[PDB]
Amino acid sequence: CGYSDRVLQLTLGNSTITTQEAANSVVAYGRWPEYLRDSEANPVDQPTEPDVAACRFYTLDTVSWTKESRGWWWKLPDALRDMGLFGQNMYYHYLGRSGYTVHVQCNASKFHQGALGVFAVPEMCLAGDSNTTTMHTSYQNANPGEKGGTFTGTFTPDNNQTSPARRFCPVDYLLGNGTLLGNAFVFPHQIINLRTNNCATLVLPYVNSLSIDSMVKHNNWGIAILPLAPLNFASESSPEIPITLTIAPMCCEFNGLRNITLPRLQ
Amino acid sequence: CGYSDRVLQLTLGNSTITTQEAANSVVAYGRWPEYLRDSEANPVDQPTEPDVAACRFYTLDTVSWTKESRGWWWKLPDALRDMGLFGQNMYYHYLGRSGYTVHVQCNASKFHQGALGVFAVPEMCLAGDSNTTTMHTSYQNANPGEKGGTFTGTFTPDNNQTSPARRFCPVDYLLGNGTLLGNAFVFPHQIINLRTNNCATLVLPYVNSLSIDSMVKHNNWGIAILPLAPLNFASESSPEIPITLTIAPMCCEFNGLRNITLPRLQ
Amino acid sequence: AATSRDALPNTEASGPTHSKEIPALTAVETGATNPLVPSDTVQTRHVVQHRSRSESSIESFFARGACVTIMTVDNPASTTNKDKLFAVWKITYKDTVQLRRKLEFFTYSRFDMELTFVVTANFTETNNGHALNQVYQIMYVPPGAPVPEKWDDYTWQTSSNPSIFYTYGTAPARISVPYVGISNAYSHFYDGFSKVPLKDQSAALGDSLYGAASLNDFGILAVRVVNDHNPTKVTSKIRVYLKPKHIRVWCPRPPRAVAYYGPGVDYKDGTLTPLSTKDLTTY
Amino acid sequence: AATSRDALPNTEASGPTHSKEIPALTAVETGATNPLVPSDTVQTRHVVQHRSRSESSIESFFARGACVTIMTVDNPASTTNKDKLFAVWKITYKDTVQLRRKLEFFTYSRFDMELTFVVTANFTETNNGHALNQVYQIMYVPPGAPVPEKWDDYTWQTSSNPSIFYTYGTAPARISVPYVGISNAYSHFYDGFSKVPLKDQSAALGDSLYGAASLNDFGILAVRVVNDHNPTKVTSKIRVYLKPKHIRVWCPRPPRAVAYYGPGVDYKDGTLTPLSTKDLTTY
Amino acid sequence: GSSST
Amino acid sequence: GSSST
Amino acid sequence: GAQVSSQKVGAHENSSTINYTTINYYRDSASNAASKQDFSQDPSKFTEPIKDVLIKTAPMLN
Amino acid sequence: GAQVSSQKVGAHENSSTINYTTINYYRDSASNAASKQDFSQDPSKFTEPIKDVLIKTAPMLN
Ligand SMILES: CCOC(=O)c1ccc(OCCCC2CCN(c3ccc(C)nn3)CC2)cc1
Ligand SMILES: CCOC(=O)c1ccc(OCCCC2CCN(c3ccc(C)nn3)CC2)cc1
Ligand SMILES: *C(=O)CCCCCCCCCCCCC
Ligand SMILES: *C(=O)CCCCCCCCCCCCC
């Protein structure tokens, strides 16, 4: 009858994604997203559950992959903080939990080469830029929002002791956290190998040491995208192809409603 | 087991067509060709039914598609008037009816572009070249036979009032008849989009306000082929690819036998 | 059993999706239109539909009396050197544009026909005299029958032709006509000729008009004022309204996009650019 | 099961009282009206009631043909430099006051509509000539359809629009119209706008009238004299009577107390003091 | 036939 | 008599 | 297809229910006359819209 | 010989199916009014004229 691993359609709320070149899809740790059960519940107040207004596909800013690209990273829910009614619900409540469908998009052509490693990391704590002090990355620098951050091929220490840069310095082969990238595959992942597939699709459960937490103070998941095999095309010395990241909140709920949180994001 | 929408074999009489790149096939108005039923019959004489001698695949002259091509048209049964025992049976009888399998052929390569709209129009009356007189296209000019006619992107009126050209002036976006081409899709059709398919295959029933009629005075169907998307290749400024048209009469029968009609076709 | 006025299908509630089923993806090359409904591509709620397609049925679309012609007749003074004007109209839906375009959405049609006649009169001379109430004779002359040459010749006897005698000021006249075609359906388009040019025979002899079948398809209406010449001249107009009832249509067609130019499909220079300016990225 | 014409409740005999029950005492603050009947506060006899509320049912209150507009048309001499006057009326219950005030006791309504047309004509010139009997064409032009620019242009063909051809001197013309609203009920009041002014966008662009929904809610009636120009000019008036039949109404409202000033609820200076002088202790 | 009431 | 429907 | 209904008879002649017959001629119900067989309802939603039911013999406020 | 049919009733009076009666007066059916009791069909012959039946959830080309 025609159905296939490579051809998928995903629909959440008013949004639909189609793909004709998938390499199946991953459900992290074998767990589909779910709402908080009464037996594991902790805040006693009636939760807010936005459903279709927030659990839909938000598309973040497109980045560009080139022969110089060392890698890109995002944190969740941070990347979605300014996205429609999801962000609004997040900033009006003290507590929130959410799962995600992450869909990474990157097409090219039968004559291009390259492979992207797409990793979903629980509690992705990154290393900072300082060798004089530790655990000192500012909230503003730790949370780039939609735009995300990048990996560097070289650790370069912040020398300005008088006005500290207070940011991350994530070295790519060390997964920006002191461990070797070749082992990042123990994390839920997919590979966008251009000869094989357009995209990566990962379904992420809420993961935490707690049933529900402060979304504004704490990121649960990190999305890390690194070039396992460098982009190459025909014979052009500096090629480029876009990587678009579309993410959907799933089975999300919120507790502790009050006035809106207005964070110092700069 | 392997069978597919794209791979077809058609066989009529001593002729077989194969295609490895089809986009299924169309049966106009959902009606397969059939012989005239007794309940709808009108001439009382025993009909002539040529069967395999006439209901077979006749291949007409190959035309050429280029970046300048505005479009091509043919009328049925006129295009088949000189084709083997079909034409002979047509010109020896006053009355005749026939259905058709139309198979349009146009291959290219994974690096070419373009889309052909193939339309089967019941009673395809075309507009003439005159702005001083109306309904004046001569029989000779209205019936090109096998060779067909072409569409123009511009209406250019016949000015010679003393010796009128007496022919059609079919403007492409007006489907040569005063209506907009974008709506021609309400007619039985297929599209040869070069990235998708080699060909178009339309099965046409006999359609008319009468059960049987004069084939020499009246065309039932018009085949109109227009470039919906222009031919393009690699970077060559003037590419060309052939369009071959193969047509088969179907379930055809004839009444009113007499001496042969010898038409003034010039 | 689906009646024209039955309600349309209800919208069904549909939830999220992550599967190998691809309704949104298709290939129009095949010649088919993708049969999608909102629940195939978005999350839908349950709606109980009440709307119906009753008014867009073929009967309902054509269920209206349309003006197809205006005939002019008169009744002058006995004295005036010019002849008393009686009218002759060849029956057709093509002298006007509106009903023609509606019928032309289809290649073939079959219907019974209702004709309603609105008759109006007026004085033409600055004069001052009067006229007594006029009676009009509307005679149908079928192809073959003697066409009238004079307001008062023998043909108006109508022993066999159908005539209506209309009295001015009374409710507008009306008759019904059966499906009168010599074909199984009326042809709105005829891609052909009524004559074969034969080689052997002379060019002028085998010639005929393109797209025209019988030179006189359905005959003519002939109208006159039955009253004798009155000293004060009165002019009158007969407006003919045509309604296709008990109608059936076959083979849909694109609507006329450029102005009609004559009885055929011909278009005229200077009228060929219907669509207006609008930019690709402008709402 | 209580029919509109059933008799009202009988008065029951009631005797003296000395108890803790207090029907006369109440508190209107609650928002309720105290449901008292005479026997609650006075000694009553037994009366068998026969009166009924039949004539004050919503149907009965509106069951009358009300004048909503007067259209003027003419038919001049061929010679006169000025154009032959045909009429164009935008359909509404608001050009006159009486039916408007009755409908405005309610916020929303739903009804089928009957229109009856009274047509009258007269001579305008001190002149002396005559006119033959006029036939009028009343065409409904729904929002979107070509509005007529001339007494005799192509639009009067009416292939799809509903027209009435009225003959002068015959009984007044009449038609029925279904509930034609694009809403579930007709809104007699709309506290809103048809446009949102957006910050980003220019001020002039987002502007619209207060309380107005569609710029053209229901289209127009276009009326003409079908007869050709007559040497003696005749002027004619068409009075349109509207009756709401099969009616339902929702959300009661206070009646208009000051003069209407336009299509909205606006009042004008100098018309705001309806009530007259009367002293508190004067019967 | 005819439904009374 | 009269056929209803 | 005739509909037969009763007249509420007012001033009876010096002459048992009296009836009148009705037949609809048109397919569209909008073409129909007004039946006038209307119903009545109780004013409660306007006169007593309070959440707690009221007893007229009792104190309105308690 | 009377024909009795139902009206699809739109805006119901503030007053069970409502009917209308029809009688043909003429021998020729061309003289008859339009019943308006028309049928509907599925667009398939125009919208899906392909030889192989289509499943919308499946690939159109396979
Ligand atoms: C090409 C023109 O349009 C048509 O195809 C077309 C137009 C009209 C049509 O009807 C055919 C004419 C039937 C006639 C036959 C009877 N008619 C009569 C008969 C009696 C009287 C008093 N008045 N009219 C007048 C109409 C059928 C087809
Ligand atoms: C704001 C104005 O008042 C209203 O709200 C209001 C006023 C009128 C009303 O009816 C809507 C108009 C329906 C039209 C539709 C059909 N009409 C026709 C149709 C044919 C002919 C010959 N003449 N009139 C005329 C009335 C509905 C609401
Ligand atoms: C039900 O109505 C059956 C009895 C019919 C009695 C005669 C009706 C009078 C004629 C009505 C003609 C139809 C109206 C268009
Ligand atoms: C079937 O129709 C039997 C009932 C007849 C009821 C009365 C009909 C009204 C008069 C019709 C006269 C005939 C029409 C030429």
Q: What amino acid is encoded at C268 in this protein?
A: K
Mutating to test ligand 4, I would choose from H4, H21, H22, H23 the residue with most ligand atoms within 8 A of its C-beta, which is H23
Measure H23 CA to ligand 4 centroid, in angstroms.
7
Query: Measured between alpha carbons, how far is B225 from B172 in angstroms, rounded to an integer?
Result: 10
Query: Measured between alpha carbons, how far is A195 from A21 in angstroms, rounded to an integer?
Result: 10
B199-204 vs B26-27, strand pairing mode: parallel
Query: Measured between alpha carbons, how far is B251 from B236 in angstroms, rounded to an integer?
Result: 45
Residues in Cβ contact with B160 at an 8 Å cutoff, skipping those fewer than 6 apart: none
The answer for A124, left when phi > 0, alpha when psi is -120 to 50, beta otherwise, is beta
The ligand placed nearest to the CA atom of residue C176 is 1
Question: Which chain A residues are Cβ-neighbours of H58 within 8 angstroms?
Answer: 1-3
Cβ atoms of A9 and A199 within 8 Å: the answer is no
**What kind and span of H or E run contains B233?**
strand B221-233
Q: From the centroid of its chain, how far is CA A68? A: 21
> What is the count of structural domains for chain C?
1
Nearest 10 degrees: CA dihedral of A89, A93, A94, A99? -30
Cβ atoms of G54 and D32 within 8 Å: the answer is yes
Query: Measured between alpha carbons, how far is B8 from H55 in angstroms, rounded to an integer?
Result: 19
Query: Measured between alpha carbons, how far is A249 from A244 in angstroms, rounded to an integer?
Result: 17
Cβ atoms of A71 and A227 within 8 Å: the answer is yes
Cβ atoms of H17 and H6 within 8 Å: the answer is yes
Protein residue with its CA nearest to atom 1 in ligand 2: D92
Contacting subunits of B (3+ beta carbon pairs below 8 A) = C, H
Cβ atoms of C87 and C72 within 8 Å: the answer is yes
User: E strands along C128-172, which residues?
Assistant: 135-141, 163-167
What are the Cα distances from residue D266, in Å, to D194, D263, D272, G12? 18, 8, 11, 51
Cβ atoms of A207 and A17 within 8 Å: the answer is no
Architecture of domain H1-62: Irregular (4.10)
- The HSE-up count of residue A180 (CA atoms within 13 Å, CB side) is 2
> Which CATH number characterizes residue D222's domain?
2.60.120.20
Cβ atoms of B5 and C27 within 8 Å: the answer is no
Query: Measured between alpha carbons, how far is A68 from A50 in angstroms, rounded to an integer?
Result: 41
Query: Measured between alpha carbons, how far is C250 from C103 in angstroms, rounded to an integer?
Result: 11
Query: In chain F, what is the straight-line distance between the N-terminal and C-terminal CA atoms, in Å?
Result: 13
DSSP C165-228: EEETTSSPEEEEE----SSSSEES---B-SSPPBTTS-TTTT---TT---TTSS-EEEEEE-S-
> Considering only CA atoms, which of B120, B129, B153 is closest in space to residue B222?
B120
Cβ atoms of D77 and D230 within 8 Å: the answer is yes
Cβ atoms of D71 and D224 within 8 Å: the answer is no
The answer for D30, left when phi > 0, alpha when psi is -120 to 50, beta otherwise, is alpha
Cβ atoms of D194 and D214 within 8 Å: the answer is yes
Query: Measured between alpha carbons, how far is D200 from A9 in angstroms, rounded to an integer?
Result: 36
What are the Cα distances from residue A86, in Å, to A55, A90, A185, A221? 8, 6, 30, 17
Check pocket membership of D189 for ligand 2, CB cut-off 6 A. Answer: no
DSSP B94-108: EEEEEEEEEEEE---
Tokens matching residue D73: 């048309």
> Which CATH number characterizes residue A184's domain?
2.60.120.20
What are the Cα distances from residue H4, in Å, to A18, C5, F2, H38? 55, 18, 8, 16
Query: Measured between alpha carbons, how far is A102 from A25 in angstroms, rounded to an integer?
Result: 10
> Considering only CA atoms, which of A95, A104, A122, A126 is closest in space to residue A31?
A122
Residues in Cβ contact with D246 at an 8 Å cutoff, skipping those fewer than 6 apart: D59, D111, D112, G29, G30, G32, G34, H11, H12, H13, H14, H15
Place of tokens 């994001």: A265
Nearest 10 degrees: CA dihedral of C164, C168, C172, C178? 10
The number of the ligand 4 atom at minimal distance from the alpha carbon of F1 is 3
Phi and psi (nearest 5°) for G30?
-60, -30
Cβ atoms of D240 and D115 within 8 Å: the answer is yes
Residues in Cβ contact with C248 at an 8 Å cutoff, skipping those fewer than 6 apart: C58, C109, C110, C111, C185
Strand partners, C173: C117
Residues in Cβ contact with B172 at an 8 Å cutoff, skipping those fewer than 6 apart: B70, B71, B151, B152, B153, B181, B226
Query: Measured between alpha carbons, how far is C168 from C161 in angstroms, rounded to an integer?
Result: 22
What are the Cα distances from residue H7, in Å, to H11, H25, H35? 12, 22, 12
**Residue C61, exposed/middle/buried by CB under 10 A (0-12, 13-18, 19+)?**
middle
CA angle D114, D120, D126 (to 5 degrees): 165
Handedness of CA A190, A191, A192, A193 (dihedral sign): negative
Cβ atoms of B73 and B225 within 8 Å: the answer is yes
Q: From the centroid of its chain, how far is CA A148? A: 8
CA angle C83, C89, C95 (to 5 degrees): 130
What are the Cα distances from residue A266, in Å, to A76, A157, A159, A168? 19, 22, 21, 15
Cβ of C35 within 8 Å of Cβ of H54? The answer is: yes
Mutating to test ligand 1, I would choose from C68, C88, C89, C91 the residue with most ligand atoms within 8 A of its C-beta, which is C91
Query: In chain B, what is the straight-line distance between the N-terminal and C-terminal CA atoms, in Å?
Result: 55
What are the Cα distances from residue D74, in Å, to C40, D78, D83, D131, H24? 59, 12, 10, 12, 41
Protein residue with its CA nearest to atom 16 in ligand 1: C177
What are the Cα distances from residue B90, in Å, to B124, C262, D60? 20, 33, 76
Query: Measured between alpha carbons, how far is B23 from C31 in angstroms, rounded to an integer?
Result: 8
> Considering only CA atoms, which of G45, G24, G42 is closest in space to residue G33?
G24
**Residue C108, exposed/middle/buried by CB under 10 A (0-12, 13-18, 19+)?**
buried
Handedness of CA G23, G29, G34, G39 (dihedral sign): positive
Measure G2 CA to ligand 4 centroid, in angstroms.
14
CA angle A101, A102, A108 (to 5 degrees): 140
Query: Measured between alpha carbons, how far is B25 from B8 in angstroms, rounded to an integer?
Result: 9
**What kind and span of H or E run contains C99?**
helix C98-103
Provide the residue count of chain H: 62
What are the Cα distances from residue G44, in Å, to D1, D34, G52? 17, 11, 12
Please report which residue ranges of chain B form alpha helices under DSSP H: 84-92, 139-142
Question: Which chain H residues are Cβ-neighbours of C53 within 8 angstroms?
Answer: 40
> Considering only CA atoms, which of C221, C166, C217 is closest in space to residue C188?
C217
Place of tokens 């991350």: A168
> Considering only CA atoms, which of A4, A244, A25, A52 is closest in space to residue C22?
A4
Phi and psi (nearest 5°) for A76?
-120, 140
Cβ of B24 within 8 Å of Cβ of H45? The answer is: no
**What kind and span of H or E run contains C103?**
helix C98-103
Query: Measured between alpha carbons, how far is A258 from A194 in angstroms, rounded to an integer?
Result: 47
What are the Cα distances from residue C271, in Å, to B111, B155, B178, C266? 40, 10, 10, 11
Tokens matching residue D86: 């045909």
Check pocket membership of D186 for ligand 2, CB cut-off 6 A. Answer: yes
Handedness of CA D210, D213, D215, D218 (dihedral sign): negative
Tokens matching residue D120: 């009258």
Question: Which chain G residues are Cβ-neighbours of H20 within 8 angstroms?
Answer: 1, 24-27
Long-range CB contacts (< 8 A, 24+ apart) of C198-203? C198/B261, C198/B262, C198/B263, C198/B264, C199/B262, C199/B263, C199/B264, C199/B265, C200/B262, C201/B264, C203/B264
C234-252 vs D106-123, strand pairing mode: unpaired
DSSP D40-109: GTS----B----B-GGGSHHHHH-S-EEEEEEEEEE--TT-SS----EEEE--S-SSSHHHHHHTTEEEE
Query: Measured between alpha carbons, how far is C259 from B21 in angstroms, rounded to an integer?
Result: 42
Phi and psi (nearest 5°) for C99?
-65, -40
Cβ atoms of A54 and C47 within 8 Å: the answer is no
Cβ atoms of B214 and B94 within 8 Å: the answer is yes
Return the DSSP state at C281. T
Place of tokens 């013309």: D173
Return the DSSP state at B215. T
> Considering only CA atoms, which of A191, A204, A227, A266 is closest in space to residue A77?
A204
Mark the breaks in chain B: residue after which each occurs, C to N over 2.5 Å: none
Cβ atoms of A202 and A28 within 8 Å: the answer is yes
Query: Measured between alpha carbons, how far is C24 from C266 in angstroms, rounded to an integer?
Result: 41
Query: In chain C, what is the straight-line distance between the N-terminal and C-terminal CA atoms, in Å?
Result: 43
CA angle C235, C240, C241 (to 5 degrees): 145
Handedness of CA B30, B35, B39, B44 (dihedral sign): positive
A221-233 vs A112-122, strand pairing mode: antiparallel
Query: Measured between alpha carbons, how far is C229 from C168 in angstroms, rounded to an integer?
Result: 16
What are the Cα distances from residue A83, in Å, to A23, A86, D163, G12? 28, 6, 55, 79
Phi and psi (nearest 5°) for D272?
-90, 10
Query: Measured between alpha carbons, how far is G53 from G50 in angstroms, rounded to an integer?
Result: 7
Sheet holding B221-233, edge to edge: B149-150, B72-76, B221-233, B112-122, B189-193
Strand partners, A247: A58, A102
Task: Provide the shortest C-alpha distance from residue B262 to chain C (in Å).
Answer: 6
The range of the structural domain enclosing residue D70 comes to: 1-283
Cβ atoms of A86 and A54 within 8 Å: the answer is yes
Q: Count Cβ neighbours within 10 Å for each residue of B157-189 and write b for 16 or more, e otherwise.
A: ebeeeeebbbbbbbbbbbbbbbbbbeebbebbb
Handedness of CA D182, D184, D185, D187 (dihedral sign): negative
Measure G37 CA to ligand 4 centroid, in angstroms.
29
Query: Measured between alpha carbons, how far is D67 from D241 in angstroms, rounded to an integer?
Result: 4
Task: Provide the shortest C-alpha distance from residue A109 to chain H (in Å).
Answer: 22
Cβ atoms of A221 and A124 within 8 Å: the answer is yes
Return the DSSP state at H57. T
Q: Count Cβ neighbours within 10 Å for each residue of A54-80 and write b for 16 or more, e otherwise.
A: bbbbbbbeebebeeebebbbbbbbbbb
Residues in Cβ contact with C246 at an 8 Å cutoff, skipping those fewer than 6 apart: C59, C111, C112, H29, H30, H32, H34
Q: What amino acid is encoded at A258 in this protein?
A: R
> Considering only CA atoms, which of A220, A223, A13, A21 is closest in space to residue A105?
A21
Measure D140 CA to ligand 2 centroid, in angstroms.
9
Phi and psi (nearest 5°) for C124?
-105, -35
Measure C161 CA to ligand 1 centroid, in angstroms.
13
Nearest 10 degrees: CA dihedral of D89, D92, D95, D100? 160
Check pocket membership of H21 for ligand 3, CB cut-off 6 A. Answer: yes
Residues in Cβ contact with A39 at an 8 Å cutoff, skipping those fewer than 6 apart: none
The range of the structural domain enclosing residue B19 comes to: 1-266
**Residue D5, exposed/middle/buried by CB under 10 A (0-12, 13-18, 19+)?**
middle
Query: Measured between alpha carbons, how far is B149 from B71 in angstroms, rounded to an integer?
Result: 9
Tokens matching residue H32: 């008859």
- The HSE-up count of residue H47 (CA atoms within 13 Å, CB side) is 10
Q: Count Cβ neighbours within 10 Å for each residue of C198-224 and write b for 16 or more, e otherwise.
A: eeeeeeeebebbbbbbeeebbbbbbbb
Number of H helices, E strands in chain A: 2, 13
